[PDB]
Design an enzyme around this catalytic site. Structure first.
Site, PDB file in Angstrom:
ATOM      1  N   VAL A 122       0.828  -1.197   0.000  1.00 16.06           N
ATOM      2  CA  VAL A 122       0.000   0.000   0.000  1.00 16.06           C
ATOM      3  C   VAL A 122       0.880   1.272   0.000  1.00 16.06           C
ATOM      4  O   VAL A 122       1.956   1.287   0.597  1.00 16.06           O
ATOM      5  CB  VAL A 122      -0.993  -0.066   1.194  1.00 16.06           C
ATOM      6  N   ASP A 167       9.978  -2.410 -14.853  1.00 23.87           N
ATOM      7  CA  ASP A 167       8.518  -2.437 -14.858  1.00 23.87           C
ATOM      8  C   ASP A 167       7.932  -1.040 -15.107  1.00 23.87           C
ATOM      9  O   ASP A 167       7.033  -0.582 -14.377  1.00 23.87           O
ATOM     10  CB  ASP A 167       7.966  -3.069 -13.574  1.00 23.87           C
ATOM     11  N   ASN A 189       3.639   4.447 -12.930  1.00 20.76           N
ATOM     12  CA  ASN A 189       4.807   4.815 -12.124  1.00 20.76           C
ATOM     13  C   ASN A 189       5.642   5.908 -12.808  1.00 20.76           C
ATOM     14  O   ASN A 189       6.867   6.007 -12.624  1.00 20.76           O
ATOM     15  CB  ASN A 189       5.630   3.611 -11.697  1.00 20.76           C
TER      16      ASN A 189
END
Ligand SMILES: O=C(Cc1ccc(-c2cccs2)cc1)Nc1cc(C2CC2)n[nH]1
EC number: 2.7.11.22
Length: 278
Positions: A17, A117, A122
């Site tokens: 989280v 990734d 992001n």
């Protein structure tokens, strides 16, 4: 953690989280990610500082829980692309963002650090026109999206290179231009066959060694390659040439971040101010 006051939950990362929080000692607003070789590799990322990399402020290992304290940015590129769906992100802003992200990659890759990734989620933006790479180096130390994954990873290369990040960034560049994901696979084979249907099934001519890769199958269907003019209209010839080089099958042929920064596409690069409502 007693030094941080949670403001609100801002996301659910791959590892845990993410909260927006306030540092009681400095008055700082931060992003707090709740998660020994891991401690050492993450501690190395604290030194990997660049204006286009989200700053890793601190690493806190307590009660066998790991907390990463990051610089906070108010929006991510996935939300910004969704918000700009009807109009499209202006080309000078797309070009500025791609240029900045390439600067970020050229820096990390020069230090032999891969992201692995990259995805719009992001990539974080601010009101000044900056864009920054988040979660750099965490892969080395909800369904995880395959849309930006390089073909060598899908084909089972376990010792992949910095070229995997150039592929992901080329996928994101195409998505900013067309307002639709380039390869929205929903399984590993759907992801690979979406790539093959657009770029052609790879063979030993375009990618020496491809047919010997761990998950390569001679039974793959053979699709013909499409013109980029059909794949990313209305991108101009400089942008299509750059994108093609970022999407070369052979990771050795794929353009580096440093060589991409010299591409003629960036001859007229500028730094516009985005339209942000927070
Ligand atoms: O991820 C964002 C953008 C973002 C900001 C606020 C919100 C919400 C506000 C209210 C509800 S959700 C949702 C997303 N920023 C961020 C993340 C990081 C570090 C990588 C952790 N640093 N900065």
């Amino acid at each position: 953690m007693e030094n941080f006051q949670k403001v609100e939950k801002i996301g659910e990362g791959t590892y845990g989280v993410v909260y927006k929080a306030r540092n009681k000692l400095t008055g700082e607003v931060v992003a707090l990610k709740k998660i020994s070789t891991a401690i050492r590799e993450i501690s190395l990322l604290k030194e990997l500082n660049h204006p286009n990399i989200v700053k890793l402020l601190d690493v806190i290992h307590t009660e066998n829980k790991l907390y990463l304290v990051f610089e906070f940015l108010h929006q991510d590129l996935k939300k910004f692309m969704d918000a700009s769906a009807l109009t499209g992100i202006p080309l000078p802003l797309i070009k500025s963002y791609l240029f900045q992200l390439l600067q970020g990659l050229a820096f990390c890759h020069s230090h032999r650090v891969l992201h692995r990734d990259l995805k719009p989620q992001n990539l974080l933006i601010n009101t000044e026109g900056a864009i920054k790479l988040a979660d750099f180096g965490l892969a080395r130390a909800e369904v995880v999206t395959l849309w930006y994954r390089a073909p060598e990873i899908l084909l089972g290369c376990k010792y992949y290179s910095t070229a995997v990040d150039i592929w992901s960034l080329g996928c994101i560049f195409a998505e900013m231009v067309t307002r639709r994901a380039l390869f929205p696979g929903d399984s590993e084979i759907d992801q690979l066959f979406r790539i093959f249907r657009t770029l052609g099934t790879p063979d030993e001519v375009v990618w020496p060694g491809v047919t010997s890769m761990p998950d390569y199958k001679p039974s793959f269907p053979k699709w013909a390659r499409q013109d980029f003019s059909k794949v990313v209209p209305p991108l101009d010839e400089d942008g299509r040439s750059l994108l093609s080089q970022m999407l070369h099958y052979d990771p050795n042929k794929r353009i580096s971040a440093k060589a991409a920064l010299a591409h003629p596409f960036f001859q007229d690069v500028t730094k516009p101010v985005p339209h942000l409502r927070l």
